[PDB]
Every structure is written in C-alpha cells, then in structure tokens.
Design an enzyme around this catalytic site. Structure first.
Site, short mmCIF file in Angstrom:
data_model
loop_
_atom_site.label_atom_id
_atom_site.label_comp_id
_atom_site.label_asym_id
_atom_site.label_seq_id
_atom_site.Cartn_x
_atom_site.Cartn_y
_atom_site.Cartn_z
N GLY C 281 0.86 -1.20 0.00
CA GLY C 281 0.00 0.00 0.00
C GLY C 281 0.88 1.23 0.00
O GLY C 281 2.02 1.17 -0.50
N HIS C 312 4.55 -3.08 -2.11
CA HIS C 312 5.36 -1.88 -1.75
C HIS C 312 6.16 -1.98 -0.45
O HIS C 312 7.04 -1.17 -0.21
CB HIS C 312 4.56 -0.57 -1.75
#
Lengths: 386, 396, 386
Positions: C281, C312
């Site tokens: 995220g 991420h």
C-alpha cells in the site's frame, strides 16, 4: 520569441500538478502538449487529489479527468524547449515504462530544462539522469534519488524548490509558484510588471481548479495574492468542489482539495489591492448574498481596477449591480444572471473563450484559464518576454 | 406503471413534473409519490429524454459548512417523453430544485413550456432552485414568492415581490403560484398544491409514529413521513437512544445491474421526539421504513414492545421493504398475510406469516390492520392503503 | 492428502469474509473454488466493506471486486470436502435462490464440514439445516436461526465462534482466526510448529488485503501476531487503502477497513519476535523514512529471522540497505527501489508468484498471498497436514 513544452502525463497523476503548470504556461504564451504512453490525443487520464486530513500520510480521491492533446508515439522531442513531469501516483509506473525512460534520457542529454515535481522525480531516478545533480522531491522520493547519485535537498517545508542549471524540482503543489517561475526563467523568460497585490473572493465549494489555477498562475508571475472568505480568518480552509463533464446534461460534483485562506475578511482594505479575482463553483451563489462581498466588488468596479470573474463568479457581479451596460461571458447557465443584471452576453463557444470589457475580464469555466489569466495579465501590465 | 390517462376522470387530476439531471432527489420523488398516493396521475419529463430514460439526482444536505454539500442520489426514471407533452391535458406543474433548474432555465423549449403553462393560470408549485426557471420565463413580475435564499437576487431582478425565507420550511402562495424554499417545506408546499388543484382533505387529525434507525432507506423514511404530514397529520420519528433533533444517517439503495442493490449515503434524517418520553398508545398508527435499520431495530426490546402494543389493539401498522424484519421478530406475523422486500420472505415465512408476492414491485397489500410494501417504488399504494385504514381522504 | 473446498459467493458479500479464507486456505495447501449462481469462472462479484464508525450499525462502502475461479452450474458436490459461506449482504438474496438452498441442503445431508460467518447463516436458516444445532452468527441473524430451530449462542464479543460437529459458525471477520482454524480441524488437518511470535510493521493507508490476509492467516495457524505503527499505541487504528485493477494503467484507490494496532511502537523490542511481516500500500513509502522502523528491519535481517514483505513493503527493506546482494520480487513499479537498493530483481510472472531468498520472502501484491504465507510458514517450520 516563443516556446513549446511537453508534459509527461499518466493515470493518477496529481490533478493540480498537471493542471496548474498546463494552464499557467499557456497563459504565459507558451505552447503545451500533453502525452501519455499507450494513449493518443483526445484520450483521458484519471487524476488523483492528494490532500491531508491529519493522517500520517496523504489521502486520495478522484480528480477531474484530464484530456490529452497530443500523441505520445508521434512526439518529436527536438520540437520541445522543455519538459514538465507532474507528481501523484503516475510516476511510479511511468518510471518502469521503457518508452518513458528513453524519452527522459534523450531529453536530459539535450540539456533543455526539465521541471519535475513531487513523485515526478522517480522517473528521473529510473532514467539515471540525476547523478551529481542537486534536487528536491516529495520527501519519500529522497532515498531513490540519493541511491541514483542525486545531491538531495531535504524539503524542510512543502513549498521548497531547487534549481540546478537545467533541472528544476519542487516537493509538492505548494511550491508551484516558485517551481513554474524558475522553469519560465530556464526557458529564457523575463517577467515584467508583476508587482501587484491581488485579492481572491473565496467561499465554500468554490470550484477546485477555478481557485487554484488562477491563484498559483498569478503567484508564479511574482504577484502578492490573497484569498478571503466571510466569517473565516488566515489559515482557515474552504472545502472545494470538482465539477467535471461526464456525459450528463450538466456537470458532476465531487470533493476537491481543501484551500487555505490567507487573510482576514474583516481586516481587509480594498484600496490596498490592485485587482480582484472571483472563482466559480457553488460559492458565488451564497457569497452573492453577503453585503460586504458586494461592497468590495462595487469598490473595485467603481475605481476601474481590474476584476476577473469566471464561470459562476459572475453571480456576485450581477447581484452587485455592476454588470449594467457591460459586456461579459459566464458559465452558460449564468447567462440568466448576466442578462437579468443589465449585462450584454458574450457567447462562450468554445467554452475556453474569455473576454475583456474595459477593466472587466470574464471566462465561462476552467477550460478557459489560459485566456482568463492572459487577459488579466494584460490589464495588470504583466508581460513574459522571450 | 400508472394508467396514464386516469387523471382525466372528474374526481382526478394529471400533474407534470419538470425534471432534469441533478435535480434534488427528495424534491422530485416526494411530490411524485405523495401526489399519486392522493389519487393524482403524475407524468415526468426531461428535455432531450424520453419515457424510460433516467436522470441522476443530487442529494443536498448541510454539514457544518457555509453552503450545502452534494452526493449522488437515486437515479430517477422518467415515464413521459418531453417533446410529446400536450400541455392542455395537465392541471398542475411541479418544478423540483437541486442543480437541474439552472441549465433547464437556459433550455428554450423549457422556457417555452413554463410560459405557456403560466398564461393558462393553472397551479405552479416550484421549490428551492426551481424558481430560476420562473425568472427566466419572466412569469413572476409583481407576484409574491419565496425560493432558496440564493435565488433571491434573480427573482427580484425579474420583478418578484420577494419573500426572504426566514426558516427553511417557509412557503408562499400568490394565486395559483406556490413556492417553497427547501424540502423541509414539503408538507405545506404539497398541501397548498393539492388545494389549488381543488383537493379537499378530510380525516387527517391523526398522530403517526415512525420507527427509525441508522441506515434506514432514504426514500422509505422521507416519502411516507412527508406525505403524511402534507395531509395535516402530526407525524413523529423516534430512534432508540436518540432524542429530538438528533439525526440518523440514511442509505440510498438502488439497483444498478448487479444481483442485489447497491448502497450510497442518503440525506441525514432528524428525529422529532425522545425515544423514552414517547407514549405509544397516544398514536393512531405505526410506520416502519426499510433499509438496514430494521435488522438491528428488530433486536431492541422497546421497539418490539411498541410493535406488539399496536398489533394487539389492531391499530394501523404500515411496514415497507426490510421493516417487516421488526414485525417477524416481534412474533406478530403469525397467521398474517404480507409482502416484503423479496429477501425478507425468509423472515416472513419463518415468522408464521403468509407471503404475498410483490409483483409488480410497487404493489402493497392490506391484511386487517396491516399494510406492507416491498420497496420504495411502492410508496403510492403504501401511503394510499394506510390512508384508507386511517379514514383519510383527498377528494376532487 | 489434500482437500478441495467450495466458497459460496454472491454480490456484496463482505470483502474480508471471502478473501481471508479464500487465501489462507490455499496457503494451507487446500484447493479452493469460488462460485456464485448465474455467474461463470472469470466473472466478478462486487464486494462490501462493512466497518464500524460509531453509528448504531455498520456502514458500507465498495471493496475489491472478486474474480470467481469456478462455474456454479458445473459444480459436482461429491468432489468438495468442505463448504465456506461469507457474510455481508450477499446471503440475504442467496438464501432465496433456489439453486443455492438446494446446494447447501445436499451438502449438509452429507455431514461434510460447513463454515458460515456473519450473515452467511441466513442461507442455513433458509435451507432448514440448523434444527437442534448450536451456532452463532451476526446478532441480527439470531431471530431467523432461533425460528429455524437453532440452539442460538448470542455472540458477546465480535470474535465469538461456535462449533457443533460439522457446523462451524462465527459472528464477524474479527473471529476469522479461530473460525478458520476450526474449519481446518474439521477437514482432518493438524497444525504443527505454529507457536511463533510475528510483528507486522503497519502504517496509515497500507493496503487493506495486504495487512488483513497475512495477519489473520498467521493467527488462524496459532501464531501470536502483533501490529505496530510509529507514534501509535495498542488500540489505535490505521485507515487502509483498497487498491484494485479496474482497466486503467495503474491501480485505483478507495478507503478500506480501519485496522486496529495491537501493541505500542515505542516500547517494542524486536528480538522478542520470531519473524517480521511488511504489508504493501502507501504506508511503506513514509515508513521507509522512520529511523526506528529501519532499525527494526536491520535487526531482523542481521539476526537472519524470517522476513516477509509484499508489494510496496519492499520500499522499507530497500531504504534499510538490507536488499544489497539479495534476491527478491516486489510490486512491478517497486523494481526501481529493489535495483537502486542493490537487489537482484525477480520477475513476478505470474503476479501471484512469491520468492524465498534465505530468510527473505517477497510477493508482488495481494493476489500472491497463498504463496506469500506458504513460504513464510516454510521458514517458520509451520505445517498443515492431512
């Protein structure tokens, strides 16, 4: 005497970071083309509104759809004098698109100015074009630029910009004024006449682009620009509305960026201002009822100072009785208020047309920003010379 | 759909509503359905659209800021085609507010329609921003009228005798011209239009209680509640643990292509009396909106007790859609006949009830003291069947 | 020795209540098929995010669209060992779809395990398969279960689960750990080695699935799992973001479920854990700038304890300098970070593939949770055996 500039766009780039440079640069006389890999002229890109709500990072919602005016596949890079890279969530994937990395590589080795803002810089890190170059960016982008050999400048405040020869960088859209100004100068531009104080009549749910783009465009030139709203003070904020045209018989509405007021409504002296600007959206219909708002408009019009009003902004001018025997345009629906206010209608077709009647500049909606700002500049004696 | 030429009967009327994209969702749907419940045939048109097309609507609410905010409401389906309208057939015209009037007011064919209707002298009821169209048609010179406060300067410039709305429920009548400032004025607005149509209301000295809750369906509360107030009933709304002037958020439920309804926020709804001070035997009838409040309301013992009290003494109880979860849970549907939202047939049948198929979906049924509907399209039969139990009549 | 399980899906089913079991059970080695009446494999169902916000009942927004992998019309029930039924707003219409009641009835008569959560149990009431059986459900489902002859257990807290022979029930997604574990047991599974302590490095706008699925899958195994975020305490919450792929050139973003932190960030000692997990995220880009966050990651990497990072999350590893000479995948855009941090890129093709390099597990995004959690288990010595 002229310039052409390419903006490297993508899906969920930050709405402000594309739109403000796009329209400010056109207002200044420069030709600007927008491209996105995989897309052609007339395709659109969704955009992101990145704002803070007091969480530990930004929140995101949808912005205006942004319609490209050029075709990435057909770009002849030798025709462009500089390049702009918007932030948002587009750079992170554009940085991995081979055709973008090639374009950026090629443009950087030509030595022509590149202005990159916020997350934009990731594409520069991927293109390996920042070695030994000084630059800032959104703070979360710093490690990648550091690892790419940049001379990193931590953005101590969100409005920080850095210039290193042909490389111009900014951290967030809060740095738009200096960012755009440094880019115009890099292009060989000289700005004269920008020693002006301008006042913006804001209110809740004024339109997101129609406040930010003229406001920042005028700051970028060097103007002192202030924003007031009745019953609010400096550092209070106004919610904003995004109005877009999504195929219904009228526009859609969703939230935009919150907008910071800079000065106190009660403290204001209209004499200390050189011009007035009125954003559109849904604030004018209620500001049109505030006496003190009407008094201020009456003072400017009486004293023949420039007044620039766009879209629904003309509802306050009409209600002030200052449109009598005057010529102007407005949002097409606001033709009712113009005609009822004694004014003569100028037809906004296409909708980006803007008009000047003596000291009064009018536009019809946000597509008209280049003309709106350009015509305001002419009244203010502001020039950008190449 | 309605029998479309029914209002031509001597004891009836036909009304046209002038619609457009982003008109205010309450300001179209409440008179659309209240007028039908009162025995009036209503047609709906939008310029450039035909019968069966639909319009987005706006939900306009206040939230602490200096003007209202907006989100999308229910899509509204037209039942008439604008360019086939024969104006001579309509006894009345309604103009909703929201964001439609400002563009409708610059539509030449709309201005032509309001001018022509205006010189006929028949009743016009316009609300909120609707009055922008009157200004544009130049039909208000010397006429007394109110509107949303921001429509003021336009009305004045068109020569209206303008009445600043002191509160949001203000209504003004000048002959056949009827005007309201906001939807808060729906009960009197609609009453005054009914009257102008020759309508006479009898039997409306009734007290009616609404069992409300968080995320009840936005139309299923607002429409029955304001229709019943328009008749001159005293209508009250209560929610456990909340009091007078507290609010309940509402849910917009609509059908958008998937195997079940979608959900979005609706308008906030203001409760009128304290849950704990209420004396339930002082009410003549009970109304239960649907949405997602009933599933949790059905667990509250005070709510179940009020339900048993009314069914016990055979007083009118009207429940729509998911409302019938409360009745089922109260044990009060045993051996009874009712409809509900289709899913809620489970609850009805499990509660000893007999299922009445809601086909078409706007059909409501009466079993003794018990009126039930399946969903918000059924509001005309739902309020009509409740009126007939209460002895309320609108006569032309 | 393996097992094949069916998940009865419908539109507006609760996003956590399909995804969590869908992906935990595959992580545990079980074949899972997902069906919805009227839909075929490769079609999608919208989902609901049901969350609390201090109103008297839950609010709803749109979650990730869910792609079905099987065709309802074609199900051969003798080939499924167990059945799962998610909650949300799908069961109320599912319960009146005659083909759905028939399927459940036929499945229940076989005595094979059925796990039903929240509103899922409405279908069981409709199928009339609960007479004399002990079950819980969402509180509002009680009267229907009671009326169907159930021996109702009012859920006193949202994590209550009940098991009556082949019938496993839960009230809400808060109960997922025990719910899923009970179902695995009913299938004849035996979990060994799950006595481990795991630390999730969380942040605001981390990805909704990428925290919840790995977190609750690890709890279902029996692991003790803590979640922390800089400047927050036990009981604080992070908002989450839902990232979905809706036909644009990058993902969309919408709010997700708020996620509760379990333990204080400032007090924390890294050595008291066996493993680290990092969700994706938009939290990693900001968490990668926090010194204490980077210290925690260096301690785990130095001590060679299992570290699992998805999508991420690898931004944090990269900034910590711990990817130098390591092999890993990441969200495609995150390759920039991996390569610039000295890592060797592993192409996540297909997107749900994960990789192990020594103590380091990486995945590209939420579709990869089955292999993400499976490979983490392998390093922790955790097994599910039939």
């Amino acid at each position: 005497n002229s310039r052409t500039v390419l903006i490297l766009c993508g899906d969920y780039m930050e709405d402000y970071e594309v739109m403000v440079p796009f329209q400010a640069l056109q207002a200044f006389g420069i030709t600007v083309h927008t491209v996105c890999p995989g897309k052609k002229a007339g395709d659109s890109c969704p955009t992101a509104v990145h704002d803070f709500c007091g969480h530990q990072t930004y929140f995101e919602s949808r912005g205006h759809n942004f319609t490209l005016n050029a075709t990435f596949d057909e770009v002849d890079l030798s025709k462009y004098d500089g390049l702009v890279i918007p932030g948002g969530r587009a750079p992170e994937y554009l940085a991995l698109t081979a055709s973008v990395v090639e374009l950026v590589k090629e443009f950087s080795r030509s030595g022509k100015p590149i202005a990159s803002i916020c997350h934009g810089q990731l594409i520069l890190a991927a293109a390996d074009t920042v070695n030994g170059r000084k630059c800032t960016a959104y703070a979360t982008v710093g490690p990648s630029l550091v690892a790419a050999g940049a001379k990193w400048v931590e953005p101590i405040t969100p409005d920080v910009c850095v210039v290193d020869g042909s490389l111009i960088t900014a951290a967030t859209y809060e740095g738009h004024p200096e960012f755009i100004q440094l880019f115009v100068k890099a292009l060989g531009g000289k700005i004269t006449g920008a020693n002006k104080r301008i006042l913006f009549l804001c209110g809740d749910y004024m339109e997101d682009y129609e406040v930010k783009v003229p406001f920042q465009s005028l700051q970028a030139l060097g103007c002192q620009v202030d924003a007031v709203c009745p019953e609010k003070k400096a550092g209070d904020r106004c919610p904003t509305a995004i109005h877009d045209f999504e195929g219904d018989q009228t526009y859609s509405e969703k939230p935009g960026h919150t907008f910071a007021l800079t000065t106190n409504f009660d403290d204001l002296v209209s004499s200390s201002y050189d011009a007035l600007v009125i954003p559109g959206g849904r604030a004018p219909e209620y500001l049109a009822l505030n006496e003190h708002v009407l008094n201020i408009v009456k003072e400017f019009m009486n004293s023949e100072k420039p007044v620039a009003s766009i879209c629904h902004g003309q509802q306050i001018l009409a209600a002030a009785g200052v449109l009598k025997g005057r010529k102007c345009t407005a949002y097409p629906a606001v033709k009712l208020n113009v005609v009822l206010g004694g004014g003569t209608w100028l037809e906004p077709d296409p909708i980006d047309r803007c008009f000047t009647d003596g000291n009064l500049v009018t536009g019809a909606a946000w597509p008209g920003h280049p003309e709106f700002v350009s015509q305001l500049m002419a009244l203010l004696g502001i020039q950008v010379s190449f």
